[PDB]
Amino acid sequence: YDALKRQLIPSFDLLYGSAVSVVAMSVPATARILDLGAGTGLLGAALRERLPDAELLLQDRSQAMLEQARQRFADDDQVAIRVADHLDELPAGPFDAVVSALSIHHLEHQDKQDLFTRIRKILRPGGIFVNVEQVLAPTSELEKMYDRQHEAHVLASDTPAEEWAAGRERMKHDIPIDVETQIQWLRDAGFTTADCLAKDWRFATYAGWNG
Ligand SMILES: Nc1ncnc2[nH]cnc12
Ligand SMILES: [Ca+2]
Numbered sequence: 093y094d095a096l097k098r099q100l101i102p103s104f105d106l107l108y109g110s111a112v113s114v115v116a117m118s119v120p121a122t123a124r125i126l127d128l129g130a131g132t133g134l135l136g137a138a139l140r141e142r143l144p145d146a147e148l149l150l151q152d153r154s155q156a157m158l159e160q161a162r163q164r165f166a167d168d169d170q171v172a173i174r175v176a177d178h179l180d181e182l183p184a185g186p187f188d189a190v191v192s193a194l195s196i197h198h199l200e201h202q203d204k205q206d207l208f209t210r211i212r213k214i215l216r217p218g219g220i221f222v223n224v225e226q227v228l229a230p231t232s233e234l235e236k237m238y239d240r241q242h243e244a245h246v247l248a249s250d251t252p253a254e255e256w257a258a259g260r261e262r263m264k265h266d267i268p269i270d271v272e273t274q275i276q277w278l279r280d281a282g283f284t285t286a287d288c289l290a291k292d293w294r295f296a297t298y299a300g301w302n303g
Contacts, residue, residue, distance in 0.1 A: 093132060098249070099249035102242065102293065103295060107224050107290055107297045108224060111135060111193070111224050111289075112141075113142075115220060115222060116143065118220040118299075122145050124149075125187060125189045126149050126182070126183060126190045127149065127151065127191055128191065129192050131195070132160040133165070147172075148171045148172070149171075149172045150162075150174070151183070153177045179199075182211065185215070186216045187214055187216065190211045190215060191221075191223075196225060197227075197267060204274065205281065208281035208283070208300075212281050212282050216302070218301060218303045219302040220299055220300070220301055220302075222297065225298065227268055227270055227295070227296050228269050228270050229293075230272070241294065242294045271291065271296045271298055274298070279300075284303055286298065286300040
């Protein structure tokens with residue numbers, strides 16, 4: 093399933109790589125990290141590669157996806173798993189970092205804002221939130237150009253026609269917003285610094301710091 097993710101997501105290495113790099117420059121080797129909506133655990137695995145000694149908690153509503161996540165980690169790896177929705181109470185922590193990839197765009201805008209507040213509450217002072225996210229263009233005219241650029245990647249990756257059809261169907265349930273609006277929502281939630289680190293049209297890695 094990993095091959096398909098790279099066919100569907102432009103600049104996979106730049107965007108996931110940027111998320112790992114900003115965490116590695118922000119938190120200690122022994123950081124406590126929550127992967128929020130870990131899915132099959134691609135972001136969690138990339139963090140473990142860079143941070144062998146980090147304490148990782150992988151959270152998702154899907155037991156099936158978390159089972160595929162646990163398969164990526166060695167039997168003796170201390171990685172922990174929690175079955176929970178984004179809208180459920182977050183784990184107590186504290187955490188040095190909270191990370192998410194391609195999950196929070198499924199939430200209503202009001203629930204995104206509430207989630208940002210609840211994440212800041214479980215972060216230590218100076219702690220980091222990182223999102224690798226599907227973002228809306230700021231105008232309907234630019235959204236058409238974002239869509240053409242996404243399709244150009246998908247077609248050039250030789251994506252099976254039925255897998256792109258399935259992708260389009262899943263995207264009817266997306267509630268994306270532009271990157272600058274959700275970065276401002278981090279500031280509104282009390283993150284003292286927020287920045288867009290990397291972007292490829294529809295996809296972006298952004299971060300907020302608690303202090
Ligand atoms: N709302 C949600 N809660 C948990 N995991 C998710 N993955 C995608 N959407 C999710
Ligand atoms: Ca989606």
